[PDB]
Amino acid sequence: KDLSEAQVERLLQAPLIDQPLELRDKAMLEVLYATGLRVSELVGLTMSDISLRQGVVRVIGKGNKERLVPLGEEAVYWLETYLEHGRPWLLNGVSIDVLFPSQRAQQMTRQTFWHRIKHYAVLAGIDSEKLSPHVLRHAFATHLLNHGADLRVVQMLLGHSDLSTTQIYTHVATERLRQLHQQDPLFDQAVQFVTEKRKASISGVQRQFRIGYNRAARIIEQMEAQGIVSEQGLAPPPF
């Protein structure tokens, strides 16, 4: 509307993670998707706003009021990965507190990050000129609410109410913070992974090739078709 789930998934998958710059953008997109943060708040995050251990980001929103927004598992993974393996290459020795610095160690603006988002939207087969931040945020929201594994209860009560983007993300943050307060080209690669590791799980295929949940799922499905795996409720091991 006009964005499909499939366009959302391609967009998140488009970044090329051997490039520090795109690995940054990958983390940025995953945070945006999970948290519903505004682009202006995203590009303004500091290192001190993140807690990977707690799984939350601190955002100064309305009234300049600090609140904690749960990041989710994918954003945590890609943040970790970015911090270890991408961000140092963006500084080249320079020392700054900006979480997502530009190519040349400066804070990005909403508009320069938006230029990045347009680049990935093209690869994803999206009209990058028609696309706007509010349409993007709302497609992220809708997709999150419909596929977040921990959000099925929220999906059931509110998925059909056609809430605003902000309302979806507020309900998502509430539910996720409640829980925290309680204590295909990859097919041949995938076949060799599953026949080797012997466990066939959507989660493992997902984290093994760092792809989205639904792509991992459609890869365990192309396998049940071709005769390779046991059914949720078979092929010999290589070597």
Short mmCIF file of C-alpha atoms in Angstrom, two decimals:
data_model
loop_
_atom_site.label_atom_id
_atom_site.label_comp_id
_atom_site.label_asym_id
_atom_site.label_seq_id
_atom_site.Cartn_x
_atom_site.Cartn_y
_atom_site.Cartn_z
CA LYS A 1 0.00 0.00 0.00
CA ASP A 2 1.68 0.60 -2.23
CA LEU A 3 4.47 -1.37 -0.56
CA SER A 4 4.26 -5.14 -0.41
CA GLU A 5 5.77 -7.39 2.22
CA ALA A 6 8.07 -8.75 -0.47
CA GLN A 7 9.41 -5.28 -1.24
CA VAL A 8 10.05 -4.75 2.47
CA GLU A 9 12.03 -7.95 2.71
CA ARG A 10 14.16 -7.22 -0.36
CA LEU A 11 14.87 -3.75 0.97
CA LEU A 12 16.18 -5.05 4.26
CA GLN A 13 18.21 -7.68 2.41
CA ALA A 14 19.72 -5.29 -0.19
CA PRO A 15 22.70 -3.97 1.77
CA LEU A 16 26.10 -5.51 0.90
CA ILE A 17 27.60 -6.29 4.24
CA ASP A 18 31.29 -6.56 3.24
CA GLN A 19 31.05 -2.73 2.71
CA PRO A 20 31.31 -0.88 6.03
CA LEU A 21 29.00 1.78 4.69
CA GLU A 22 26.27 -0.66 3.72
CA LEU A 23 26.78 -2.68 6.90
CA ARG A 24 26.03 0.59 8.72
CA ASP A 25 22.93 1.08 6.58
CA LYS A 26 21.89 -2.53 7.35
CA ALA A 27 21.99 -1.90 11.10
CA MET A 28 20.19 1.41 10.53
CA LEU A 29 17.42 -0.23 8.54
CA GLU A 30 16.99 -3.01 11.12
CA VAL A 31 16.69 -0.48 13.94
CA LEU A 32 14.21 1.59 11.93
CA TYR A 33 12.11 -1.51 11.17
CA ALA A 34 11.98 -2.80 14.75
CA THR A 35 11.59 0.47 16.61
CA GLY A 36 9.66 2.81 14.35
CA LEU A 37 12.05 5.60 15.29
CA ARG A 38 11.95 8.69 13.02
CA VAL A 39 14.84 9.10 10.55
CA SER A 40 15.85 12.29 12.39
CA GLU A 41 16.07 10.38 15.67
CA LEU A 42 17.88 7.46 14.01
CA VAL A 43 20.71 9.49 12.46
CA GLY A 44 21.09 11.26 15.81
CA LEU A 45 21.60 8.19 18.02
CA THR A 46 24.81 8.09 20.06
CA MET A 47 26.78 5.13 21.30
CA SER A 48 25.44 5.66 24.78
CA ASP A 49 21.82 5.25 23.58
CA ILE A 50 22.28 1.55 22.88
CA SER A 51 22.25 -1.35 25.26
CA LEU A 52 22.81 -4.60 23.42
CA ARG A 53 22.80 -6.52 26.69
CA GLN A 54 19.35 -5.15 27.60
CA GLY A 55 18.17 -5.18 24.02
CA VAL A 56 16.92 -1.58 24.00
CA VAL A 57 17.63 1.81 22.61
CA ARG A 58 17.10 5.03 24.56
CA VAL A 59 15.27 7.61 22.46
CA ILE A 60 14.63 11.23 23.36
CA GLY A 61 11.21 11.78 21.77
CA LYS A 62 8.42 14.26 22.48
CA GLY A 63 8.97 16.75 25.31
CA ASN A 64 12.62 15.73 25.07
CA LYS A 65 11.52 12.75 27.25
CA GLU A 66 13.76 9.66 27.40
CA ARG A 67 12.08 6.32 26.78
CA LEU A 68 13.34 2.76 26.21
CA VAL A 69 12.35 1.00 23.00
CA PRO A 70 13.13 -2.72 22.65
CA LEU A 71 15.34 -3.43 19.59
CA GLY A 72 14.47 -7.07 18.90
CA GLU A 73 16.86 -9.89 18.02
CA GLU A 74 17.69 -8.94 14.38
CA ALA A 75 18.53 -5.33 15.18
CA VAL A 76 20.74 -6.49 18.07
CA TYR A 77 22.61 -8.93 15.88
CA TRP A 78 23.17 -6.38 13.08
CA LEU A 79 24.15 -3.67 15.56
CA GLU A 80 26.74 -5.93 17.14
CA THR A 81 28.02 -6.93 13.75
CA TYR A 82 28.17 -3.32 12.56
CA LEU A 83 29.90 -2.10 15.70
CA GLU A 84 32.56 -4.77 15.56
CA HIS A 85 33.14 -4.99 11.84
CA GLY A 86 31.89 -1.84 10.09
CA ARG A 87 31.95 1.32 12.22
CA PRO A 88 35.74 1.41 12.87
CA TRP A 89 36.27 1.67 9.13
CA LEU A 90 34.01 4.73 9.01
CA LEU A 91 36.09 6.58 11.58
CA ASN A 92 39.63 5.69 10.55
CA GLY A 93 40.99 6.47 14.03
CA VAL A 94 38.67 9.45 14.58
CA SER A 95 36.84 9.36 17.93
CA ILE A 96 33.18 10.45 18.07
CA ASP A 97 30.02 9.42 19.88
CA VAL A 98 27.75 9.28 16.81
CA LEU A 99 26.34 5.75 16.39
CA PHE A 100 25.93 5.97 12.62
CA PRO A 101 28.58 8.29 11.25
CA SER A 102 28.93 9.23 7.63
CA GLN A 103 31.67 8.03 5.33
CA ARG A 104 33.87 10.84 6.66
CA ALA A 105 33.20 10.66 10.42
CA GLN A 106 30.26 13.11 10.53
CA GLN A 107 26.67 12.84 11.73
CA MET A 108 24.39 12.12 8.77
CA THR A 109 21.25 14.14 8.09
CA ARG A 110 17.81 12.77 7.47
CA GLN A 111 18.21 13.66 3.82
CA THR A 112 21.55 11.96 3.24
CA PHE A 113 20.27 8.82 4.96
CA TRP A 114 17.19 9.06 2.79
CA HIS A 115 19.46 9.04 -0.27
CA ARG A 116 20.80 5.69 0.97
CA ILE A 117 17.29 4.35 1.46
CA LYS A 118 16.45 5.29 -2.13
CA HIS A 119 19.45 3.30 -3.41
CA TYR A 120 18.25 0.10 -1.66
CA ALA A 121 14.65 0.73 -2.67
CA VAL A 122 15.74 0.59 -6.32
CA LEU A 123 17.44 -2.79 -5.82
CA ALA A 124 14.31 -3.90 -4.03
CA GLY A 125 12.16 -2.97 -7.02
CA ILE A 126 10.48 -0.04 -5.25
CA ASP A 127 9.71 3.34 -6.84
CA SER A 128 12.38 5.33 -5.02
CA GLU A 129 10.94 8.67 -6.19
CA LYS A 130 7.36 8.04 -4.99
CA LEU A 131 8.57 6.55 -1.72
CA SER A 132 8.21 8.68 1.38
CA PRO A 133 9.33 8.20 4.98
CA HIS A 134 5.77 7.80 6.32
CA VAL A 135 4.83 5.12 3.72
CA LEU A 136 8.05 3.28 4.51
CA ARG A 137 7.57 3.43 8.28
CA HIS A 138 4.03 2.14 7.99
CA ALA A 139 5.03 -0.77 5.75
CA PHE A 140 7.72 -1.68 8.31
CA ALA A 141 5.11 -1.44 11.10
CA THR A 142 2.61 -3.60 9.27
CA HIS A 143 5.19 -6.19 8.37
CA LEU A 144 6.60 -6.28 11.90
CA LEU A 145 3.18 -6.68 13.45
CA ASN A 146 2.34 -9.47 11.00
CA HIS A 147 5.60 -11.46 11.32
CA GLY A 148 7.16 -10.64 14.70
CA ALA A 149 7.29 -14.03 16.41
CA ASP A 150 6.64 -12.53 19.83
CA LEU A 151 3.87 -10.21 18.64
CA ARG A 152 1.20 -12.73 17.64
CA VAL A 153 -0.96 -11.68 20.56
CA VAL A 154 -0.77 -8.01 19.46
CA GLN A 155 -1.42 -9.05 15.86
CA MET A 156 -4.54 -10.92 16.97
CA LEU A 157 -6.05 -8.01 18.91
CA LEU A 158 -4.94 -5.07 16.70
CA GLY A 159 -3.70 -6.32 13.29
CA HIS A 160 -7.06 -5.56 11.67
CA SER A 161 -7.78 -2.22 13.36
CA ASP A 162 -5.72 -0.26 10.80
CA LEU A 163 -3.95 1.70 13.50
CA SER A 164 -1.48 4.47 12.74
CA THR A 165 2.21 3.71 12.47
CA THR A 166 2.94 5.29 15.85
CA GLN A 167 0.15 3.35 17.52
CA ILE A 168 1.43 0.07 16.10
CA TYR A 169 4.95 0.80 17.36
CA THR A 170 3.67 1.90 20.78
CA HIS A 171 1.76 -1.35 21.20
CA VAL A 172 4.82 -3.28 19.96
CA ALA A 173 7.17 -1.51 22.39
CA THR A 174 4.80 -2.06 25.29
CA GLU A 175 4.50 -5.77 24.65
CA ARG A 176 8.19 -6.27 24.03
CA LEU A 177 9.19 -4.26 27.10
CA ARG A 178 6.74 -6.26 29.16
CA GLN A 179 8.56 -9.41 28.12
CA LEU A 180 11.98 -7.94 28.87
CA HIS A 181 10.81 -6.97 32.34
CA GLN A 182 9.99 -10.66 32.85
CA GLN A 183 13.51 -11.90 33.60
CA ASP A 184 16.86 -19.64 -4.40
CA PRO A 185 20.59 -18.90 -4.94
CA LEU A 186 21.40 -20.07 -1.39
CA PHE A 187 19.54 -23.37 -1.86
CA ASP A 188 22.60 -25.52 -2.67
CA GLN A 189 24.50 -23.88 0.20
CA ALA A 190 21.46 -24.45 2.45
CA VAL A 191 21.12 -28.14 1.49
CA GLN A 192 24.78 -28.73 2.48
CA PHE A 193 24.26 -26.88 5.74
CA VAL A 194 21.16 -28.81 6.80
CA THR A 195 22.52 -32.24 5.67
CA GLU A 196 25.71 -31.42 7.65
CA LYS A 197 24.23 -29.81 10.81
CA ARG A 198 21.42 -32.43 10.68
CA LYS A 199 19.01 -30.03 12.42
CA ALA A 200 16.63 -28.41 9.93
CA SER A 201 15.31 -25.18 11.49
CA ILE A 202 14.05 -21.93 9.95
CA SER A 203 15.97 -20.12 12.72
CA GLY A 204 19.30 -21.83 11.97
CA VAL A 205 19.11 -21.33 8.19
CA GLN A 206 18.24 -17.71 8.99
CA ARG A 207 21.22 -17.01 11.21
CA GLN A 208 23.57 -19.22 9.18
CA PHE A 209 23.19 -17.16 5.98
CA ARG A 210 22.02 -13.92 7.69
CA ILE A 211 18.80 -13.69 5.65
CA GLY A 212 15.22 -12.81 6.64
CA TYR A 213 12.92 -15.28 8.45
CA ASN A 214 10.49 -15.70 5.52
CA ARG A 215 13.29 -16.36 3.02
CA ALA A 216 14.78 -19.01 5.34
CA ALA A 217 11.27 -20.49 5.62
CA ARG A 218 10.77 -20.61 1.84
CA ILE A 219 14.15 -22.35 1.64
CA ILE A 220 13.10 -25.14 4.06
CA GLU A 221 9.97 -25.36 1.87
CA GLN A 222 11.84 -25.72 -1.43
CA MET A 223 13.63 -28.55 0.39
CA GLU A 224 10.55 -30.49 1.50
CA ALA A 225 9.50 -30.30 -2.16
CA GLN A 226 12.82 -31.65 -3.53
CA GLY A 227 12.80 -34.54 -1.03
CA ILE A 228 15.57 -33.42 1.32
CA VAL A 229 14.06 -32.68 4.79
CA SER A 230 11.81 -34.15 7.45
CA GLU A 231 8.42 -32.47 7.93
CA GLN A 232 7.67 -30.06 10.80
CA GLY A 233 4.80 -32.08 12.28
CA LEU A 234 15.92 -37.30 4.86
CA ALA A 235 18.92 -36.86 2.54
CA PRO A 236 22.27 -38.61 3.25
CA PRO A 237 25.17 -36.56 4.75
CA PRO A 238 28.02 -35.34 2.51
CA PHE A 239 31.63 -36.46 3.02
#
